[PDB]
């Protein structure tokens, strides 16, 4: 079943456990966060400043900016993984918006273990830019966590943190982790 209890540690913030990852989402700016990975949720060129792309390609800073166009134009990409710039991580996946929600979420996942990773801090990955729907994103983001859980996949992976720019966009996530509780 998978599910542990919806509480809050802090003001504004809410967690619960799936399987043995601790899950947790809050308001606020996600260039300020600290984590092994940070999520990037841009165009199909890998090009984008506006929204979440806009506050991570500036606060990451131009190397980062000239990494992801570079890798842009050597293949076609589903997701890229850079360095981390001047943001408090070690690597910046950049997952396309447009794409299937589920889908980039796994591959964070998949990637963050390929490097012996702890933590994750992703945006609502597909609401800014790409205009998806709130809830189908917050079901996308916590199936990809439940599948990779149910799969045995965590290994190295602890803490996966949702940090969203609007207040409104959090209450859709925190009803839906009321509704999967134990
Ligand atoms: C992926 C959703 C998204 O872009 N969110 C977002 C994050 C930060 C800022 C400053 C504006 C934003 O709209
Ligand atoms: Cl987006
Ligand atoms: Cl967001």
Known sequence: MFYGT???????????????I?????????TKEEAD????????????????????????GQNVERECSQQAQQRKNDY????????????????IGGNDVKSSVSSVLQECEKKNYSSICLPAIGTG?????????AEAII??????VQK??????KKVKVVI???????????????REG
């Open 37 to 60: 990975v940070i999520v990037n949720s841009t165009s199909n060129s890998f090009n984008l400043k506006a929204g979440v792309s806009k506050a991570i390609l500036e606060c990451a």
């Open 165 to 179: 720019f609007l207040p409104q966009v959090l209450d859709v996530f925190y009803a839906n982790m009321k509704k």
């Open 129 to 137: 830019n790409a205009k998806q729907h709130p809830d189908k994103v």
């Open 80 to 95: 890229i993984i850079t360095g981390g710039g001047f943001l408090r991580c070690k690597n910046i996946i950049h997952v």
């Open 22 to 30: 601790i899950f947790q989402v809050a308001s606020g700016d996600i």
């Open 152 to 157: 045995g996949s965590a290994q190295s992976v």
């Open 143 to 148: 199936d990809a966590i439940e599948d990779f």
């Open 6 to 20: 919806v509480s809050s540690p802090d003001s504004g913030v809410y967690e619960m456990k799936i399987g043995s």
